Ligand binder design. Structure first.
Ligand code: FAD
Ligand code: FAD
Ligand code: CA
Ligand code: MG
Ligand code: MG
Lengths: 247, 247
C-alpha cells in the first residue's frame, strides 16, 4: 500500500469536533464511494486510518469529512493540521461501497450517520451511473442540527437532480423544523421516514445503502430483514442492502 | 398594545447567540410577513420588542427566531425562557412586509440577513398567493455557516416548491461548499449572486424584498437604484423594492 505526500490546502471547522480537510495529492484515480488512508507520524511511528472521499473522483480537491474522536489516536492530530501541512495519503483507493456493486432498483436509499455521509456526496456530485434508478433518497442522521455540515451542498444537489433526489435530515433529540427526530431504525419502523420522503422502503422497490455507526447499520439491517424480508446483497445471491461500517 | 399571555412550549438553541422560541398564545389572525411584540417584566417594568412570526398564519406553534444581543435589554431575558414560562404577546400583528403589498412580477427575490429570514419563512410555509410568481428566490446571508439555522426547513421548502423556489446561502466570513462567500450588495454588483441563483435581478423581471440589517437594506437599495433603475415601491409610485429594517 504505497503512499504519496498530500498537502493540506483548506481546513473547515464546522463544530468543536467536526472538520473537513481539503488536500492536493498525486493519488491514482478512484471510484466514487471509495476511501483512502490518511497517515501521520505519532510518537515515532506511522499511524493511519481509513477516510472516505467526499469529492467526486474527477475533482482534484480531495475532501475528507472527519470527527475528532475523544481519546482517538489519529483524528485529533488530523484536527490540528493547517493549510500547507503534509499528510500521507494511500495512493490507491479501497472499498466496495460503490455504484458498481449496487443492483438496479426503482429507489436507491442512502443512509448515513455523522461523517459517513461522505461516500454518498462523492457519488451524487459525480452523478454518473444513476440514470438506471427512478428515485434517489439521501438520509443524513447526526446528533444535533449543528452537525449537519453539508446542507448547503445538499441544497445544490437537490436542485441539480430536479426532484429525483429526495433528501431528509434526522437529529437525535432536538425538535428542528424540517428534520425528523430520533433513531433511523425507529423512524423506518414507525413509518415516519417513508412518510417524510414520500417513497416506500421495501423489497419490491428499494436497495438500501447503510454507512457509518455500526449500531445504526446493524439495527436497521435486522429490522429490514425481520420485518420487510429484505436481505444483504451479494453478487452470487442478489439482495437489497449494502453496508459500510465506520467502526 | 392589547396583549395576551403566551406559554413557551419549546426553546431551540441553535448557537451561543441564536435561538428560536415556540409559543402558544390566543393572538388574533395575522398575515404572513407580519410581526408582533413579545414582552417581559424587567426590574418592575414591562419591556417589549418586535419579533417576526416564522410560522405560517394557520400554524398555532408561534415561532420566533432571535439573536441574543449581548447585554441587550430584552433579548437575553427571552433567551433565558424555558418551556412552561410565560411571555407577553401583543394580540394584533403589525407590518406591511406581506405579499398583498408586493406587486406582480416574474421573479420575487427575498433577501435577509441573520434572523430576518423569519417573514419569508412564514410566507413560504403558508404557500398562498405565490401562484402569480414564476420564480421565488430566498437568499439567507449570515456571517458563518453555523448561523444558517433554518437550512433543514429551507431544503424541505425547496423540495416541495418543485423548482419554483431557489434557496441561496451567503456566508461573509468563510468558504463553504454550496455557499456563496461575501456580502449581499457586493455580490449583486459583481454578478455572483445572479450567477449562483441562475436568474437576473432587474427592473423588467424582478421585485426585491429586503429584511434585516439596515446597512444591508440601505446599501442594496442604493445600488439597485443607481445601477439598475430600480426604485422603492409605493401604492402611488409603483416600484421594485420592499424593505423592513430590524433596527
Ligand atoms: C471504510 C472506512 C471509512 C471511514 N471514513 C471516515 C470518514 O470519512 N470520516 C471519519 O471521521 N471517520 C471515518 N472512518 C473512521 C476512521 O477510520 C477512524 O476510525 C476514526 O478517525 C477514529 O480514529 P482515531 O485514530 O482517532 O481513534 P482510535 O484511536 O482508532 O479509536 C477508535 C476507536 O473508537 C471508535 N471509533 C471510530 N470512529 C468513531 C466514532 N465517530 N465514534 C466513536 N468511536 C469511533 C472505534 O471503536 C475504534 O476502535 C472510516 C472508517 C472506515 C472503516
Ligand atoms: C419589525 C421588527 C421585527 C423584528 N424581528 C426580529 C426577529 O424576528 N428576531 C430578532 O432577533 N430581532 C428582531 N427585531 C429586533 C428586535 O425588535 C430587538 O431590537 C432585538 O431583539 C434586540 O433588543 P434588545 O432589547 O435585546 O436590545 P437593546 O438593548 O434594545 O439594544 C438594541 C441594539 O441591538 C442590535 N440589534 C437589534 N436587533 C438585532 C438583530 N435582529 N440582529 C442583530 N442585532 C440586533 C442593534 O444593534 C440595536 O441597536 C425586529 C425589529 C423590528 C423593528
Ligand atoms: Ca396588492
Ligand atoms: Mg416531506
Ligand atoms: Mg446555483
Amino acid at each position: 500500500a504505497d503512499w504519496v505526500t498530500g498537502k493540506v490546502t483548506k481546513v473547515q471547522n464546522w463544530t468543536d469536533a467536526l472538520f473537513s480537510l481539503t488536500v492536493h495529492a498525486p493519488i491514482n484515480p478512484f471510484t466514487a464511494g471509495q476511501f483512502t488512508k490518511l497517515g501521520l507520524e505519532i510518537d515515532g511511528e506511522r499511524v493511519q486510518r481509513a477516510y472516505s472521499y467526499v469529492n467526486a473522483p474527477d475533482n482534484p480537491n480531495l475532501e475528507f469529512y472527519l470527527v475528532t474522536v475523544p481519546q482517538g489516536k489519529l483524528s485529533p492530530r488530523l484536527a490540528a493540521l493547517k493549510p500547507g501541512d503534509e499528510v500521507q495519503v494511500v495512493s490507491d483507493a479501497s472499498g466496495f461501497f460503490v455504484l458498481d456493486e449496487v443492483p438496479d432498483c426503482e429507489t436507491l436509499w442512502m443512509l448515513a450517520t455523522g461523517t459517513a455521509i461522505g461516500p454518498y456526496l462523492s457519488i451524487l456530485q459525480y452523478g454518473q451511473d444513476v440514470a438506471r434508478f427512478k428515485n434517489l433518497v439521501l438520509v443524513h442522521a447526526a446528533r444535533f442540527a449543528a452537525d449537519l455540515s453539508y446542507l448547503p451542498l445538499m441544497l445544490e444537489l437537490q436542485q441539480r437532480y430536479e426532484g429525483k433526489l429526495r433528501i431528509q435530515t434526522v437529529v437525535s433529540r432536538e425538535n428542528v423544523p424540517g428534520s425528523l427526530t430520533g433513531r433511523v431504525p425507529a423512524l423506518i419502523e414507525n413509518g415516519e421516514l417513508e412518510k417524510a420522503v414520500g417513497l416506500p422502503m421495501d423489497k419490491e422497490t428499494s436497495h438500501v445503502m447503510l454507512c457509518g455507526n455500526p449500531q445504526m447499520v446493524r439495527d436497521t439491517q435486522q429490522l429490514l430483514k425481520e420485518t420487510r424480508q429484505m436481505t444483504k446483497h451479494l453478487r452470487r445471491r442478489p439482495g437489497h442492502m449494502t453496508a459500510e461500517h465506520y467502526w
